[PDB]
């Protein structure tokens, strides 16, 4: 492999993936690849980006090759770093990457969801860092955001992210890399979630399930795989297991691989990715990295290797697939306490509008290093003293306030500033005890003719001056 020629870009046509050069169907034979430490005090990323460190990726690629994978799933990259060496070394061995756009500390919050300028900036940074690589198979815009019947209202926020990532990619000069979603496997929500992500005017491009139903020496029938396969027959977009490898008893046989690539399942599923390469506290690994940073192969590795080696999925060509076929789904009805994802999505976050808040507000909280753990406490307090309707985002009802798309810190700054103005002590003491709070002297500078922040200023002046105290 000299450059990227061993990995032609994969495209989606209907509900299958195809090699863009040969037209042969593409099946994912994958593994999750993400290394945990082991940095905070020295301001390094909390996560490790193995794809930006040749020392790590060049160690592991020979073992990934032994294993027989053609795809990795990666959960977090650092978009400020180069990825050319590791992505090309993967390509040279015929390996592709499925990549989440989020990172552990910048993701859609299932406990208080918003689709905002900060998360969108994160997504765009990843897209711009990784889209040059023909072996970038697809991006995940969310990973099990909704996870049970109590947080289904997070799903509209994820669909907005899919829409906005797709639009950003379409307007860019990049290859049109598909954007999809990865979900869990909760019985009460699974059918609604699959329908929701292909309903209405916005759709995921592909759909991964984190699939742990087959434990030990199970079968197609007894595991649940037969039932899931029947559920997904004719589902309009490609589907695959984004994770598999139940670890109730170890060593894991990985006999589910025989079913997955067998004739019955290969007509519906596009393959899957084992979870996971590294042995960490959760006991899902196939290798252990020792104290000197060497790779020790574990019993699970040999089992998975043997299963991948004999998996020979029967695909069909693009031409055969398209023969006699030309590739609008109703969204699930709302039922209080069961399914609460409105079809009406939040709008694309507006960076320019939100940026005006940074300039004009008297009281602000600095994003860098802020203790986000205290934010629930801070909102409960602030919203008991001023009216937080202007930042409320309700995915149940499809109601989104004027500043609901701004960053969490911008939202806090807006309510903190409202409270400062309501109290009216005019003493530059912002009424919130956090080291990241400060009085913004730029707020004392009048907007000139003709500032691009005049409209936001008018909004904020109206909101602060007319706060319901008659």
């Amino acid at each position: 492999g000299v450059s990227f020629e061993k990995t032609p870009a994969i495209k989606i046509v209907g509900n299958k993936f195809f090699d863009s050069e040969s037209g042969e169907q593409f099946f994912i034979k994958g593994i999750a690849y993400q290394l945990q430490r082991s940095a905070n005090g020295a301001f390094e990323t909390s996560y490790i980006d193995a794809l930006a460190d040749p020392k790590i990726c060049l160690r592991d690629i020979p073992f990934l090759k032994m294993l027989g994978v053609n795809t990795l799933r990666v959960y977090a990259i650092d978009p400020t770093k180069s990825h050319d060496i590791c992505m090309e070394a993967l390509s040279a061995e015929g390996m592709y990457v499925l990549l989440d756009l989020s990172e552990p500390d910048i993701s859609i919050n299932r406990e208080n969801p918003s689709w905002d300028v900060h998360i969108f900036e994160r997504y765009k940074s990843v897209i711009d860092a990784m889209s040059s690589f023909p072996n970038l198979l697809g991006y995940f815009a969310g990973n099990q955001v909704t996870n049970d019947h109590t947080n289904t209202f997070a799903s509209p926020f994820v669909k907005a992210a899919i829409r906005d990532a797709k639009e950003y990619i379409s307007h860019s000069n990049h290859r049109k890399i598909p954007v999809g979603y990865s979900t869990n496997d909760d019985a009460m929500t699974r059918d609604n979630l699959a329908r929701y992500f292909v309903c209405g005017d916005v759709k995921a491009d592909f759909y991964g399930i984190n699939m742990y139903e087959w434990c030990g020496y199970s079968t197609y029938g007894t595991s649940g795989y037969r039932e899931r396969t029947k559920e997904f027959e004719g589902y309009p977009i490609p589907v695959f297991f984004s994770e598999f490898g139940c670890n109730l008893v170890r060593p894991r046989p990985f006999t589910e691989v025989s079913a997955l690539y067998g004739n019955k399942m290969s007509s519906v599923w596009s393959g899957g990715l084992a979870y996971m390469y590294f042995e960490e506290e959760n006991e899902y690994g196939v290798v252990k990295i020792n104290d000197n940073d060497g790779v020790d192969i574990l019993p699970d590795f040999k089992n998975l290797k043997k299963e991948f080696a004999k998996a020979d999925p029967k695909g069909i060509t693009e031409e055969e697939y398209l023969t006699a076929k030309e590739p609008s789904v109703e969204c699930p009805h709302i039922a209080v306490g069961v399914w609460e994802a409105n079809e009406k999505l939040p709008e694309t976050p507006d960076r320019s509008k939100c940026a005006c808040l940074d300039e004009i507000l008297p009281c602000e909280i600095v994003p860098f290093g802020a203790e986000s753990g205290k934010y629930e406490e801070y909102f409960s307090y602030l919203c008991s003293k001023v009216d937080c309707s202007d930042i409320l985002a309700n995915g149940k009802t499809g109601e989104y306030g004027e500043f609901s798309d701004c960053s969490v810190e911008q939202k806090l700054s807006l309510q903190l500033s409202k409270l400062y103005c309501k109290i009216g002590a005019n003493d530059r003491h912002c009424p919130l005890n956090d080291k990241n709070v400060y009085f913004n002297l730029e707020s004392l500078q009048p907007l000139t003719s003709e500032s691009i922040c005049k409209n936001v200023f008018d909004s904020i002046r109206n909101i602060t001056y007319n706060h319901g105290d008659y």
Side-chain angles (χ1 to χ4, degrees), residues 213-227 229 255-260 265:
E213 286 175 26
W214 182 303
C215 303
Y217 292 106
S218 195
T219 66
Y220 184 57
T222 61
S223 61
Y225 276 24
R226 190 167 55 204
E227 292 159 294
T229 297
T255 49
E256 61 269 35
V257 171
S258 287
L260 183 52
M265 292 187 75

Short mmCIF file of all heavy atoms in Angstrom, two decimals, residues 213-227 229 255-260 265:
data_model
loop_
_atom_site.label_atom_id
_atom_site.label_comp_id
_atom_site.label_asym_id
_atom_site.label_seq_id
_atom_site.Cartn_x
_atom_site.Cartn_y
_atom_site.Cartn_z
N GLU A 213 -26.95 -9.07 22.98
CA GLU A 213 -27.92 -10.14 23.24
C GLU A 213 -27.36 -11.57 23.23
O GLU A 213 -27.88 -12.45 23.91
CB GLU A 213 -29.06 -10.06 22.21
CG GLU A 213 -30.02 -8.86 22.49
CD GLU A 213 -31.08 -8.66 21.43
OE1 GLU A 213 -31.43 -9.64 20.74
OE2 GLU A 213 -31.53 -7.50 21.24
N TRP A 214 -26.31 -11.78 22.45
CA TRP A 214 -25.74 -13.13 22.33
C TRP A 214 -24.61 -13.27 23.33
O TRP A 214 -23.54 -12.65 23.15
CB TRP A 214 -25.21 -13.29 20.90
CG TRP A 214 -24.63 -14.64 20.54
CD1 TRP A 214 -23.59 -15.31 21.15
CD2 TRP A 214 -25.01 -15.43 19.41
NE1 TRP A 214 -23.33 -16.49 20.48
CE2 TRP A 214 -24.18 -16.59 19.41
CE3 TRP A 214 -25.95 -15.26 18.38
CZ2 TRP A 214 -24.28 -17.57 18.42
CZ3 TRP A 214 -26.05 -16.25 17.39
CH2 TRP A 214 -25.22 -17.39 17.42
N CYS A 215 -24.84 -14.08 24.36
CA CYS A 215 -23.84 -14.30 25.40
C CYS A 215 -23.39 -15.76 25.41
O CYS A 215 -24.20 -16.69 25.54
CB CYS A 215 -24.34 -13.90 26.80
SG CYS A 215 -24.88 -12.16 26.92
N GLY A 216 -22.08 -15.97 25.26
CA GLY A 216 -21.55 -17.34 25.34
C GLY A 216 -21.96 -18.16 24.13
O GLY A 216 -22.01 -17.64 23.00
N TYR A 217 -22.26 -19.44 24.37
CA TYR A 217 -22.60 -20.36 23.29
C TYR A 217 -24.08 -20.34 22.93
O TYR A 217 -24.80 -21.33 23.10
CB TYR A 217 -22.11 -21.77 23.65
CG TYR A 217 -20.60 -21.88 23.68
CD1 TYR A 217 -19.91 -21.97 24.90
CD2 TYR A 217 -19.85 -21.92 22.50
CE1 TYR A 217 -18.52 -22.09 24.93
CE2 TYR A 217 -18.46 -22.03 22.52
CZ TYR A 217 -17.80 -22.12 23.76
OH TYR A 217 -16.42 -22.25 23.79
N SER A 218 -24.53 -19.20 22.40
CA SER A 218 -25.95 -18.99 22.08
C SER A 218 -26.24 -19.48 20.66
O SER A 218 -25.38 -20.08 20.00
CB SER A 218 -26.32 -17.50 22.24
OG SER A 218 -27.72 -17.32 22.28
N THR A 219 -27.46 -19.20 20.18
CA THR A 219 -27.82 -19.52 18.80
C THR A 219 -28.59 -18.37 18.17
O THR A 219 -29.11 -17.50 18.86
CB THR A 219 -28.70 -20.78 18.72
OG1 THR A 219 -29.96 -20.51 19.36
CG2 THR A 219 -28.03 -21.98 19.43
N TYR A 220 -28.69 -18.38 16.84
CA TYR A 220 -29.50 -17.42 16.09
C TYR A 220 -30.92 -17.29 16.67
O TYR A 220 -31.42 -16.19 16.90
CB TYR A 220 -29.55 -17.87 14.63
CG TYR A 220 -30.28 -16.93 13.69
CD1 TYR A 220 -29.88 -15.60 13.57
CD2 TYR A 220 -31.36 -17.37 12.93
CE1 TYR A 220 -30.54 -14.72 12.70
CE2 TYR A 220 -32.02 -16.49 12.05
CZ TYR A 220 -31.62 -15.18 11.96
OH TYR A 220 -32.27 -14.33 11.10
N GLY A 221 -31.54 -18.43 16.95
CA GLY A 221 -32.88 -18.45 17.49
C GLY A 221 -32.97 -17.94 18.92
O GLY A 221 -33.78 -17.05 19.22
N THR A 222 -32.14 -18.48 19.81
CA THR A 222 -32.31 -18.22 21.24
C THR A 222 -31.76 -16.85 21.69
O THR A 222 -32.21 -16.29 22.69
CB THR A 222 -31.68 -19.35 22.09
OG1 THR A 222 -30.28 -19.42 21.82
CG2 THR A 222 -32.34 -20.71 21.80
N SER A 223 -30.80 -16.32 20.95
CA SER A 223 -30.15 -15.07 21.34
C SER A 223 -31.07 -13.87 21.23
O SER A 223 -30.90 -12.89 21.97
CB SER A 223 -28.95 -14.81 20.45
OG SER A 223 -29.36 -14.69 19.09
N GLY A 224 -32.01 -13.93 20.29
CA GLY A 224 -32.72 -12.71 19.90
C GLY A 224 -32.35 -12.20 18.52
O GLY A 224 -33.03 -11.33 17.96
N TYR A 225 -31.25 -12.72 17.96
CA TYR A 225 -30.76 -12.27 16.64
C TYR A 225 -31.81 -12.49 15.56
O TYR A 225 -31.97 -11.63 14.69
CB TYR A 225 -29.46 -12.97 16.26
CG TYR A 225 -28.17 -12.37 16.81
CD1 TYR A 225 -28.16 -11.60 17.98
CD2 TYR A 225 -26.95 -12.62 16.17
CE1 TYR A 225 -26.96 -11.06 18.46
CE2 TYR A 225 -25.75 -12.12 16.65
CZ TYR A 225 -25.76 -11.34 17.80
OH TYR A 225 -24.56 -10.84 18.24
N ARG A 226 -32.53 -13.61 15.62
CA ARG A 226 -33.58 -13.87 14.61
C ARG A 226 -34.67 -12.80 14.66
O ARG A 226 -35.11 -12.31 13.63
CB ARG A 226 -34.19 -15.26 14.76
CG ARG A 226 -35.10 -15.67 13.60
CD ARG A 226 -35.43 -17.15 13.65
NE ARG A 226 -36.00 -17.51 14.94
CZ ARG A 226 -35.97 -18.73 15.46
NH1 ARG A 226 -35.38 -19.73 14.81
NH2 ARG A 226 -36.52 -18.95 16.65
N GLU A 227 -35.10 -12.46 15.86
CA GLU A 227 -36.16 -11.46 16.05
C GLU A 227 -35.67 -10.08 15.55
O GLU A 227 -36.38 -9.39 14.81
CB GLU A 227 -36.62 -11.45 17.52
CG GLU A 227 -37.38 -12.74 17.94
CD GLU A 227 -37.40 -13.00 19.46
OE1 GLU A 227 -36.32 -13.27 20.07
OE2 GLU A 227 -38.50 -12.99 20.06
N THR A 229 -33.40 -9.48 13.37
CA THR A 229 -33.21 -9.54 11.93
C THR A 229 -34.55 -9.34 11.21
O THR A 229 -34.62 -8.58 10.23
CB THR A 229 -32.51 -10.87 11.54
OG1 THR A 229 -31.21 -10.89 12.15
CG2 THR A 229 -32.33 -11.00 10.02
N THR A 255 -19.10 -16.71 18.98
CA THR A 255 -19.81 -17.54 17.98
C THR A 255 -20.91 -16.74 17.27
O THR A 255 -21.41 -17.17 16.23
CB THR A 255 -20.41 -18.80 18.61
OG1 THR A 255 -21.13 -18.45 19.79
CG2 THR A 255 -19.32 -19.80 18.96
N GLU A 256 -21.28 -15.57 17.83
CA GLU A 256 -22.24 -14.68 17.17
C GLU A 256 -21.75 -14.25 15.80
O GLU A 256 -22.55 -13.89 14.92
CB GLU A 256 -22.60 -13.44 18.02
CG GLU A 256 -21.42 -12.49 18.39
CD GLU A 256 -20.75 -12.86 19.72
OE1 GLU A 256 -20.66 -14.07 20.03
OE2 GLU A 256 -20.31 -11.93 20.44
N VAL A 257 -20.43 -14.26 15.60
CA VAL A 257 -19.84 -13.84 14.31
C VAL A 257 -20.32 -14.78 13.21
O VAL A 257 -20.62 -14.33 12.09
CB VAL A 257 -18.29 -13.80 14.40
CG1 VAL A 257 -17.63 -13.57 13.02
CG2 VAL A 257 -17.85 -12.67 15.34
N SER A 258 -20.40 -16.08 13.51
CA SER A 258 -20.88 -17.04 12.51
C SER A 258 -22.30 -16.73 12.03
O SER A 258 -22.60 -16.89 10.84
CB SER A 258 -20.77 -18.47 13.03
OG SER A 258 -19.40 -18.86 13.04
N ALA A 259 -23.16 -16.29 12.95
CA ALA A 259 -24.53 -15.92 12.62
C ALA A 259 -24.56 -14.62 11.81
O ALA A 259 -25.22 -14.54 10.77
CB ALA A 259 -25.37 -15.78 13.89
N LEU A 260 -23.84 -13.61 12.31
CA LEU A 260 -23.84 -12.28 11.71
C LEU A 260 -23.48 -12.29 10.22
O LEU A 260 -24.07 -11.54 9.44
CB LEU A 260 -22.87 -11.37 12.48
CG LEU A 260 -22.76 -9.92 12.05
CD1 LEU A 260 -24.13 -9.26 11.98
CD2 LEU A 260 -21.86 -9.15 13.03
N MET A 265 -28.44 -13.53 8.07
CA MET A 265 -28.17 -12.19 8.58
C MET A 265 -27.46 -11.28 7.58
O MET A 265 -27.62 -10.05 7.65
CB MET A 265 -27.38 -12.25 9.90
CG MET A 265 -28.23 -12.83 11.02
SD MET A 265 -27.46 -12.74 12.65
CE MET A 265 -27.68 -10.99 13.00
#
